[model samples]
Target chain A: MIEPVLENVQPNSAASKAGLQAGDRIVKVDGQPLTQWVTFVMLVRDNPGKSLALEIERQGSPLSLTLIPESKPGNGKAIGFVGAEPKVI
Target chain B: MIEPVLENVQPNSAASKAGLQAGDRIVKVDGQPLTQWVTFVMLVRDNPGKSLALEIERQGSPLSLTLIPESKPGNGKAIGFVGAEPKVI
Candidate 1:
């Protein structure tokens, strides 16, 4: 399976607040293997505005962090710093 | 809050296999209130090839359906009949 690409990160999003930057490839969430971008998005979104633990690979190194989903101002699109757009194959 | 509008349904997806059609408004998932498209996608995506129960509003009527996430053949993007594209507001 192809690795998920971190396409975009919403400003002040959970990902951003947790210090997740674009281009960071997520390796796991709560210990579950994260193989797809959609899966990562879904796991984050399902948590609502709650903090979640994540394992990511950035620059060929593994790092762990916790992020919380923050509600966006308009329409509550579930925006946060950790937002990602899946790369189309 | 605006209701989530179903934008697209993937062919042979769990949503499609369960008879979910386009333009369906998701009301709830597993009894949790579904208010936004991102939240719905997150809920569905986090399941990881598991069946989920959904509550939807189609044609102004409420209906219940159980959708299981089927792994897409390539890249494992979690493709299924119950796919959706959030309408930007």
Candidate 2:
């Protein structure tokens, strides 16, 4: 299974406030193992301002963090947004 | 002058290699003080794989660094990219 690793984390963003860092490999979202980046994006985008548990592996150490996706005005409805991007393959 | 502050820095990218950080206000580029972000983008886009000096202010301290923007496939000729973004107003 290919896990998504964070490449960049914006300052003062939800991910940054949650202490997420670049090179952190995402293992699971809300206890569900994620094999694709789109799944994570969908989960985040669907839940505006909602808290989600993130299971990650950093430097070979397993860790968990909680983050609340910020709500942003979208085309129609407000969507959750975390100022972070995945590493390009 | 509204100096552009970095919002994110992609890992292993040119900006990251130069030790640029989020919240670091750009003071100058190649000894020329920058007043807008577009000017900086234009400079980076035009110079691929060329070393350039960056003057920045972080936490009230001034710092200088050097970085070479990486060339990427663009519309026509290859363009430079640093994998960084500025904070939105």
Candidate 3:
């Protein structure tokens, strides 16, 4: 399974407020393994206004952080976002 | 704040493998406080095939677990599903 790492985090966004910094390698979210990078986006997008915790490896140390993302609608299409800032992925 | 407690757990369900046993008290999902027990179902329902971490309090001790639920259909329309079993809520 490909571990989806957080390459970027939006400032003042849920990811940022949750203390998720760039370069954090993900070990797992809950207990399921991550296979694709896009899964991260879908997971965040679908579960809006809900909290999600990320188990990440930062600087050779393991850090677990929880994130309660405010729902920002995605594309009008099942996966599209309108009037939304490029938030966390 | 209303802390939703898991009163039931479906056998062989994703919630089961994630160590979500009955009587477990939730502290937070990701990093957000759980105001409604229904939120647990919604969060799991929305992010299918992805992992979700739950920071729960079991037996008065803080325990964290991550769950990656296989994609199961829900509801029928926006929140609907077919040929699906009674899944985790």
TM-score of each: 0.47, 0.49, 0.39
Q: lDDT, candidate 1, residue A25? A: 81
Give the alpha-carbon lDDT of every model: 0.62, 0.71, 0.53
The lowest-lDDT stretch of 10 consecutive residues in candidate 3 chain B is B79-88
Per-prediction TM-score of chain B? 0.79, 0.87, 0.70
Please state the error at residue A15 of candidate 3 in Å.
Answer: 41
DockQ order of candidates, top first: 1, 2, 3
Better of 1 and 3 by TM-score: 1
Interface RMSD of each: 11.7, 15.9, 15.3
The parts of candidate 3 lying over 4 Å away from their true place are A1-89, B1-3, B72-89
What lDDT score is found at residue B4 in candidate 1?
A: 75
Model 1 C-alpha lDDT per residue in residues A1-89, reported as the tens digit of each score: 22466534545456667887656888888889968655665665567667678888889999998877554432234443234344333
Q: Could you give the fnat of all candidates in order?
A: 0.00, 0.00, 0.00
Report how far residue B22 has shifted in candidate 3, in Å.
0.8
lDDT of 1 by residue, B1-89 (tens): 22477544545657777677766888888889967655665555567677788888889999998878665432334443233333333
Which prediction has the highest DockQ against the true structure?
1
Report the poorest 10 consecutive residues by lDDT, candidate 3 chain A: A79-88
Q: Which candidate do you rate higher for DockQ, 2 or 3?
A: 2
Under CAPRI classification, how is model 3 graded? incorrect
